[model samples]
Target: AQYEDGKQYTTLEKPVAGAPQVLEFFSFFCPHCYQFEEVLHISDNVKKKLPEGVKMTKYHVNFMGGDLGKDLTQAWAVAMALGVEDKVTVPLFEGVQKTQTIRSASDIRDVFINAGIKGEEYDAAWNSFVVKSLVAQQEKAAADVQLRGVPAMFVNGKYQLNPQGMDTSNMDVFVQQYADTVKYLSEK
Candidate 1:
């Protein structure tokens, strides 16, 4: 028997070496992910709880099954490539999930334009090989992790965990609890 919160993790085949990798598989299109980030207090969680050198990253999972999904993933890939993801991530998510704005890649381009990226610059990066390749790589990573759902986490890229249908309320408490889980996985 493991800890009370231990029932949900499944062993992963490949965890990164050295610092633990804490990856969240999410999509801006997923309302649940928004709530997860809010409830989990993600930035605060990462700042205080992550072990030194632990890697924290979010992967935009694409399974929305439409041009909308493809379009947004492309926009996300371009944002990451253009170095505006950090600033744009939340707004992009809010725009899509809450406002129903940002319908296509060009709309995303406008977002960047406002953020000070030249319009032409975003147009070029939007369809570059770099964006394409990164999108492909993300797809591969999601597949490798066998990611079947949104709002999932893979600690060290190997130990996949979920909350066993737990409520999203009281998220930071679970973050601390999951910190324990991550430490537990790190040693094994």
Candidate 2:
């Protein structure tokens, strides 16, 4: 299924409403996503510099790897369902980057525990329909978009960066260019 118009690509609602949207396609196990995070920082300063009304939404793809990829995808969906996307996204990425622990369902739960999401809430969300739906949404996006890699980005539904082209070293430049593109598009 293609992304639902209102659900997956909602109008910007934070920092400002009606701004251009940025949809980031990534996986928790992706090393490039980790490297991009270093430059993105995700701090208030970086968010403040973004064009007004632009919103960043992440779509976690799990088509790569094996069982661990499935696990990370489920965890991300749970975080979003629990309204803890902001709380879990970075720390979960950090856990994957810093620890040697296997990235599995139980392992991801441990990471959530460390990140302050209650065990009961995590458990509830994990098995809930909400997470299942989010996972389905992610799978649909990957299939429809013909995504073959992690850390890909789409600006207003157009592919902006991918592994097949663009040097990894130019991620910072690309991010800035993405923002500028959003600014330009928002004006159109």
Candidate 3:
């Protein structure tokens, strides 16, 4: 079956190899997503411990429906299009989570600029075809996934963990369970 283009999947043609693919579905305004950052950092270490082939890609959600959320999502898409995912990912997370800053397009752009992304490059990428495509793709994924909140994680496009499916209060245990699930699925 065909999925929503640019919304449900990315233009990144190649799928992750060796390890099970971990898709993190999150949002810039989500407190949970912010809290979950620590878990993601832990997972980064776990990725190294794996046999090899495990990869993780983050998909920031824009379902919140506001100028702020939309702008943050747009910035994220632009970063991904420019292949500077890491450059902006954690910083953006910190910007939103720690400082509680960035509530509009201008705000997000400022954060990007402060993070060393040139204004010209940021502007160009923000309006680039790839970024636009990814924005549309994220919208489609939101619809297809039937998501109700942010910080959802999909393992191998099958198992998913969200507020309802997993306990967010105890993140460490949930993350461990998630990792084990991915390992098991990969071995099958």
Per-model TM-score, in order, reads 0.81, 0.74, 0.75
Which of candidates 1 and 2 reaches a greater TM-score? 1
- Residues 1-188 of candidate 3 have per-residue lDDT tens digits of 22222332322233333323666678867777766664355346335444467677677777664777888778889888877776777777777777867656887788778878899999999888888888887776666556667776555655454234334467666566555544554443
Q: Compared to the true structure, candidate 3 yields what TM-score?
A: 0.75
lDDT of 1 by residue, 121-154 (tens): 8778876999899788678778777778887777
Model 3 bad stretches (over 4 Å):
1-20, 39-46, 49-51, 162-173
Q: 138, model 2: CA deviation in Å?
A: 1.2
5-40: candidate 2 lDDT, tens digit per residue:
232223322232221255567877788777666546
Off by over 4 Å in 2: 1-20, 42-51, 162-174, 186-188
Q: Which candidate is the best by lDDT?
A: 1
lDDT of 1 at 186: 47
| Stretches of candidate 1 exceeding 4 Å from the true structure | 1-8, 13-20, 165-169, 183-188
lDDT of each: 0.69, 0.64, 0.64
Among residues 3 or more apart in sequence or in different chains, the pairs in candidate 2 whose N, CA or C atoms overlap within 3 Å are 19-53
lDDT of 3 at 187: 45
- TM-score, candidate 2, is 0.74
Instruction: Using TM-score, give the best candidate's number.
Output: 1
